[PDB]
Amino acid sequence: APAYARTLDRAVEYLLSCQKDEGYWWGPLLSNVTMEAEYVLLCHILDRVDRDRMEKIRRYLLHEQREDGTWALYPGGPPDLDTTIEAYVALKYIGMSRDEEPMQKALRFIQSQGGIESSRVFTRMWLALVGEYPWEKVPMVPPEIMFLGKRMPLNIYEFGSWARATVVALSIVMSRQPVFPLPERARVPELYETDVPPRRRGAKGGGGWIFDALDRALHGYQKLSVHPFRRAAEIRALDWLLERQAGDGSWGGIQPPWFYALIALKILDMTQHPAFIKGWEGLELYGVELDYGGWMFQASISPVWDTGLAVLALRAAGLPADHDRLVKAGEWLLDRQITVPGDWAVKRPNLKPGGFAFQFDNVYYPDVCDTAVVVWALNTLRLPDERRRRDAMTKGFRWIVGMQSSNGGWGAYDVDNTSDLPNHIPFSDFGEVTDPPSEDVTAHVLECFGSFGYDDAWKVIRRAVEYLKREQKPDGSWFGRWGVNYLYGTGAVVSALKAVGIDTREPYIQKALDWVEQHQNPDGGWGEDCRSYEDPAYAGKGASTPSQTAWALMALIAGGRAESEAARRGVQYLVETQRPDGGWDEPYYTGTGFPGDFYLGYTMYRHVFPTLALGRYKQAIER
Ligand SMILES: CCCCCCCCOCCOCCOCCOCCO
Numbered sequence: 343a344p345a346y347a348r349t350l351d352r353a354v355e356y357l358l359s360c361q362k363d364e365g366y367w368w369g370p371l372l373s374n375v376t377m378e379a380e381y382v383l384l385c386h387i388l389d390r391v392d393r394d395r396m397e398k399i400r401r402y403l404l405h406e407q408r409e410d411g412t413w414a415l416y417p418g419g420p421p422d423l424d425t426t427i428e429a430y431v432a433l434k435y436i437g438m439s440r441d442e443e444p445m446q447k448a449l450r451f452i453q454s455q456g457g458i459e460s461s462r463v464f465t466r467m468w469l470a471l472v473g474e475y476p477w478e479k480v481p482m483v484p485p486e487i488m489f490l491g492k493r494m495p496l497n498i499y500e501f502g503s504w505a506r507a508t509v510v511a512l513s514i515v516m517s518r519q520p521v522f523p524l525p526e527r528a529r530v531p532e533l534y535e536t537d538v539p540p541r542r543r544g545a546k547g548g549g550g551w552i553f554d555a556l557d558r559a560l561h562g563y564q565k566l567s568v569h570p571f572r573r574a575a576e577i578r579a580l581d582w583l584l585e586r587q588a589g590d591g592s593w594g595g596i597q598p599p600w601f602y603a604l605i606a607l608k609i610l611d612m613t614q615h616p617a618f619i620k621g622w623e624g625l626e627l628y629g630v631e632l633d634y635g636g637w638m639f640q641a642s643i644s645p646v647w648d649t650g651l652a653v654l655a656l657r658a659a660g661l662p663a664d665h666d667r668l669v670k671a672g673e674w675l676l677d678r679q680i681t682v683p684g685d686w687a688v689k690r691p692n693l694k695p696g697g698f699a700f701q702f703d704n705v706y707y708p709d710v711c712d713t714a715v716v717v718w719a720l721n722t723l724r725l726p727d728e729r730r731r732r733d734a735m736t737k738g739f740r741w742i743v744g745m746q747s748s749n750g751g752w753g754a755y756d757v758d759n760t761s762d763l764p765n766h767i768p769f770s771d772f773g774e775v776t777d778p779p780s781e782d783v784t785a786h787v788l789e790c791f792g793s794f795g796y797d798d799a800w801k802v803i804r805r806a807v808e809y810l811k812r813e814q815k816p817d818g819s820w821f822g823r824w825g826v827n828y829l830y831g832t833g834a835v836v837s838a839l840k841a842v843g844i845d846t847r848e849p850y851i852q853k854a855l856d857w858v859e860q861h862q863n864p865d866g867g868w869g870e871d872c873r874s875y876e877d878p879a880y881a882g883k884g885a886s887t888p889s890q891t892a893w894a895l896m897a898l899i900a901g902g903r904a905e906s907e908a909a910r911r912g913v914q915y916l917v918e919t920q921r922p923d924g925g926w927d928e929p930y931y932t933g934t935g936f937p938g939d940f941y942l943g944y945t946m947y948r949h950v951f952p953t954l955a956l957g958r959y960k961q962a963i964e965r
């Protein structure tokens with residue numbers, strides 16, 4: 343048996359050993375230290391500071407700090423000002439003196455970059471909440487935003503789902519401009535002393551007279567003593583949040599809206615209300631005790647995604663469709679299907695619910711990637727209740743079809759969330775504020791649809807293929823919206839095109855395959871650093887990683903190049919780097935939350951992607 347077959351066997355065993363008893367897989371989702379620095383400030387604001395938890399956060403913050411005293415958005419990344427400021431503030435709050443060495447190094451970096459005035463809106467706002475920055479200088483999000491109807495400019499349904507609940511809860515918070523002063527010893531006036539002139543970070547899409555004027559007017563309005571209908575607007579914001587709280591207590595299964603909603607409830611004197619109580623208590627599910635004694639808070643949690651990918655990888659590796667561990671995973675997945683309408687129903691009010699979310703319980707926010715991967719995984723299994731499996735797949739498939747956007751692609755949560763307005767408000771200087779269709783999500787949908795044998799005679803698929811063709815870059819690659827980066831998008835897109843019957847001998851696909859081969863590293867693997875999002879010199883370039891090597895391999899295998907020196911060397915790379923336990927290490931992030939601003943380490947990718955790629959490789963070589 344060739345070396346790759348034994349490597350595969352060991353990967354399969356390792357992946358099965360990671361499965362939880364209930365049937366799902368779930369790895370920690372890594373990001374950056376602003377999650378934990380903001381949890382420290384949240385504890386301060388809510389007056390619920392647990393000393394033992396603070397010690398573990400201190401230990402984690404220091405462990406994440408690099409030797410030059412800075413923190414980054416991803417492992418090996420450039421020093422990040424916003425992140426370093428928040429870690430410094432949380433450390434001083436926990437108890438480190440500004441005279442300790444780690445604090446001095448951090449401060450030197452912070453002051454070298456223009457301090458607190460050069461930091462993003464959310465960092466200044468967290469400081470305003472604790473009395474360290476003026477609320478008058480934070481861009482206003484007025485509660486009267488709730489009066490804008492669904493076809494009005496800047497209404498909440500023009501924002502992407504992850505920004506929408508944030509806008510609603512912050513409209514309550516900014517309405518009151520609450521201040522929860524820090525103890526004297528934790529104050530940070532030193533963050534205003536700068537080496538260089540501070541420079542305000544602006545809106546990602548660029549501001550403009552009308553937007554600066556509106557922001558100025560909203561601050562002037564804020565100063566008035568009477569605000570007609572403001573209370574009514576606040577009640578709409580509160581009701582909107584109360585109706586949509588997720589079953590785990592979060593808002594949308596993600597850190598920002600959750601923390602801001604809890605502050606909004608605190609400010610409204612609702613700490614004895616079940617939404618606040620359950621919202622507070624649910625936080626522990628997202629915390630992770632680390633092996634070196636630290637504690638972290640997950641930006642989000644990925645069990646459905648981890649599970650659907652693991653099933654696909656194990657099926658590709660050779661486990662039968664009725665393997666008992668996969669049957670258990672399949673039955674667990676069937677119970678996660680959502681049968682109620684979510685915010686997506688604003689654009690699709692007659693579309694029958696059938697999606698899946700990322701987290702365990704988040705019914706109002708199913709997403710296209712999880713639905714595609716779960717429907718596809720279910721299609722590879724044989725379960726005891728076949729009629730239930732078929733009905734689930736039909737409902738999920740139909741829900742994906744109904745969520746297709748007008749340009750032929752799919753966004754993650756909504757249809758046609760393409761408004762250009764949210765990009766120009768002062769508030770939006772960080773991350774993405776809208777959810778337009780992207781290449782990788784579209785490609786995953788096509789892989790799912792392709793698994794049922796459909797092709798571009800079906801206009802849904804044809805429109806999607808034309809969208810991918812228009813988005814292909816000049817060098818032949820495809821961008822990675824949610825995975826790192828041109829390797830991820832290129833790998834997803836070529837697999838998708840192959841899966842729906844496109845002839846991979848066409849020149850545009852051959853060009854993408856050559857792009858993949860030209861980026862292979864000397865060690866035989868492929869890698870792509872997160873610097874790729876802001877620097878063209880890093881396109882398809884970085885230290886090799888198991889997951890990015892797997893993506894490149896999948897592009898080559900889908901393109902008919904399994905029997906090529908490039909694929910042989912990639913397989914050998916995976917063989918040679920596999921750990922004794924059958925898994926792989928991956929100290930670099932290969933996930934993307936927001937291009938340029940927020941990166942993710944999906945800890946299962948290093949095991950599930952190599953298993954998947956090696957299984958596809960084996961099948962291509964055997965056939
Ligand atoms: C009976 C109450 C009034 C309901 C009438 C609806 C009137 C429509 O709009 C007027 C108020 O809305 C203005 C919104 O504030 C600006 C939005 O967001 C600011 C930038 O983030």
Ligand SMILES: CCCCCCCCOCCOCCOCCOCCO
Nearest residue numbers: 504596641642647700709711754824935
């Ligand atoms: C603003 C910093 C806090 C970051 C939270 C932003 C949350 C944005 O979503 C990113 C993580 O959640 C993944 C959701 O979408 C689908 C999951 O499948 C993944 C790739 O297609």
